[PDB]
């Protein structure tokens, strides 16, 4: 079927891509970066994140594969030595697909713009003070004053969420996790402090208090948004599909990345 390959750009990934294309030329596999059914990312987790957002509007018709030319990634969990074994099994097909939940972010103006995140979405202050009211399912939960907030997907919990003290969540759990960035807690201000894990259909809303200008990041893309009235977080109805060929469990991936390999 149709396939494409993204590269980190260095010599190692660029030439691994040209070799896989050549091996794909020995099967009925046509290169198409417009309507691919298989997207192969060669590089790191950042290169994989770029590939996800490249084809975020065809998520249901695409299976993703990650090849790490440097260290082991959580999305790029295939070694370069397995590339030739990869093209053969990609060609035959009959592979299984695994799906991970995604995070939907809605940003309102005084108009709405929505985004999809594979790792997390964060809201941070321009430079001045960051105060936001946190509303959970139309109920005011807290008034946060600090550096920012981070809402993570399950597969994103090993990323930014982890450095903020969040828990690591197995990706079969359809949930999202909110973490704080340097919360002020004294006589006037009071936050929960602990990370929060929300199920499906739960809507977490961030609302401004004085300043209505902040930086909003979705994965690796920080966007300054003006005249923002609301930021809505909920588990997306859409999912990312991975091409599954071997057993590499999430907890073994966590062990290899953080304990030792």
């Amino acid at each position: 079927m149709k396939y494409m390959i993204t590269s980190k750009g260095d010599e190692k990934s660029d030439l691994l891509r040209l070799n896989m294309i050549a091996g794909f030329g020995e099967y009925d596999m046509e290169y198409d970066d417009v309507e691919p059914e298989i997207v192969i990312s060669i590089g790191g987790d950042g290169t994989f994140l770029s590939a996800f957002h490249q084809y975020e509007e065809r998520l249901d018709e695409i299976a993703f594969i990650g090849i790490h030319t440097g260290h082991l990634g959580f999305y790029a969990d295939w070694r370069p030595a397995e590339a030739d074994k990869l093209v053969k099994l990609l060609a035959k097909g009959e592979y299984q697909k695994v799906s991970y939940p995604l995070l939907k972010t809605t940003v309102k103006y005084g108009k709405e713009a929505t985004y999809l995140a594979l790792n997390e979405s964060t809201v941070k202050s321009s430079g001045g003070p960051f105060v936001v009211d946190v509303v959970i399912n139309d109920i005011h939960f807290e008034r946060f004053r600090g550096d920012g907030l981070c809402m993570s997907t399950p597969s994103g919990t090993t990323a930014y969420n982890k450095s903020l003290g969040g828990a690591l969540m197995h990706p079969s759990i359809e949930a999202m996790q909110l973490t704080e960035m340097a919360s002020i807690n004294n006589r006037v201000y009071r936050t929960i402090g602990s990370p929060l894990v929300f199920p499906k259909h739960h809507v977490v809303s961030l609302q401004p208090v004085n300043d209505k200008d902040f930086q909003i990041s979705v994965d690796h893309l920080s966007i300054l948004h003006r005249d923002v009235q609301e930021i809505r977080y909920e588990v997306s109805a859409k999912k990312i599909h991975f091409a599954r060929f071997r057993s590499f469990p999430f907890w073994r991936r966590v062990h290899d990345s953080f304990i030792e390999d």
Copy 2:
């Protein structure tokens, strides 16, 4: 139907219990502490935890209610003023039931003994050094050296899990969360540090290295177990059922207990 009421023992809870029994005498509600279908706990979360373990073998035939005579609890979320409104709606029936996940703990010897936890189960050292190998689904994940480990239910995440840095999980999520107690991390020893959230059917196993004697707590019951070869944690197939009469969402319960009421 059949019902019983447990009391914390102080004058306030003891006499609130006698008044509810009297009001129950005005309906076809018989007092039975052997085979009750409704268990009312008057006191605190500790009094509710006692009531759960009193009837842990009839969980599927019982609906629990908690009345807090002191501060607001997470299980005792009914105020004493609503007691007379409680007996009437308890009598008519037609109420809804909500269910929270539980944690199953299996302890092996060189024989097996299993327990059910509503808050958490913890493993801690006698006094000497605590080393355990942590195995996740038959894969060795880490060698923990520290004070202990805590495996929490969703509704237990606001308890011991919270004080150990764990995340707060909505109880509709069928999961368990593992947290560390003062982990040694240097050149020799290495743990994940972050809390871990496991889905159903995932089995977390704790295995001894040198000392085979530790204290194992299940909710409020610390048991010294000897010749222990394994401690197995997984989300239980059993659930606790609450009598639902009004809307008191979990996040509002979290807000009132920790932010301010």
Copy 3:
């Protein structure tokens, strides 16, 4: 002697200032905002921080007083009701002075600019990735990748340092404390994680790796500095002097601000 008074600008602080000036007119106390020997700050800790930096070049010839018109501050620890008792004892003199350590920050270019901080100095990334080599007394200690670093004075440990997990230090200790902001820790990157407390004459140096542009804050003043080759932190030889009239210990100030008053 010579004195001046800064105000937060609201009606409460502005009119408390005019009343203290009037009461000062009944003594041999001349108002001089050029060469004052007594600087009175009416407002909050932010108003006091502004007053410190207003007269940072005459620190050795000035005694500071803070009056909080809102909640209790750590520098503004005098209540408005004590203002008339304040002017009398300010007039007679014979008061004692207490001194708190300060933090010196040196920023080098490819030229040097130095600053004095009463709370802390932080280095953060523009928007892109933040990597800095941390050198302690000319020895490379770690390569930090994350959101930023915070170096706090003793009296600043209850501020930004506290929200980043740092320890609270009694101000009689001539030291500085470094804390991390969301450190990446995996197979490639590795930081100490724990806060670090340095004595006098110890020099902590931050050095760039790729990007040489960051935001550098000194108290409430965030400055974008370009072509930065080094940022040097050490306990300053200069000290801030407070006019001491009553006993308000630091730990009681901590208790009232964070436990409850």
Copy 4:
């Protein structure tokens, strides 16, 4: 002069000790384990901690040396290969001494018993609930409910204090640091949470509320104390003296032990 050597007991340390004694026999150095002026510890930090408490009543007349036969320690910072270079310079003398602060613990009954700690002293509950009132310089600061409290020396901050989130303190600072163990924080109970660093002459007192029985550890020695009315912590007037032969700075020792060597 007079000297002695303690060994961990394994073959490596036992035979390194016999070789150093033989090399010492070639100088005017007499072996005396009753009144030694030089105490050499061969093993780990635990073996060094044992040697400190062996001679805690002659601290002012003794210089300590640590040799690590396993991994690098913070007190045993000499490699076994340097043992022959050690005996020569130990024999000539003319070496310098460095001193680290110690922690004094006083335990009162209804009588007083005092102890000296090189790492830390901790107070923990038997099994039941742990509540203690924390008094700082005769002022009630907080009512702690949790697992326990840890008061660390500067050189102990890389040990138990570190695993509890405490800051790492350079040993030239005459101070002590208090850290919490799993504090309960809700509507009823409230602790500072942050670690606390106290200077000299500051007295931190722990006082019971209901239960008067707890476990009190001083370094590696956990002692169950009954009928305890008070536990008093303050920086000791006594200091431990190390034989200084080379430059191995504390921060390099921290780097090698935790970052990588």
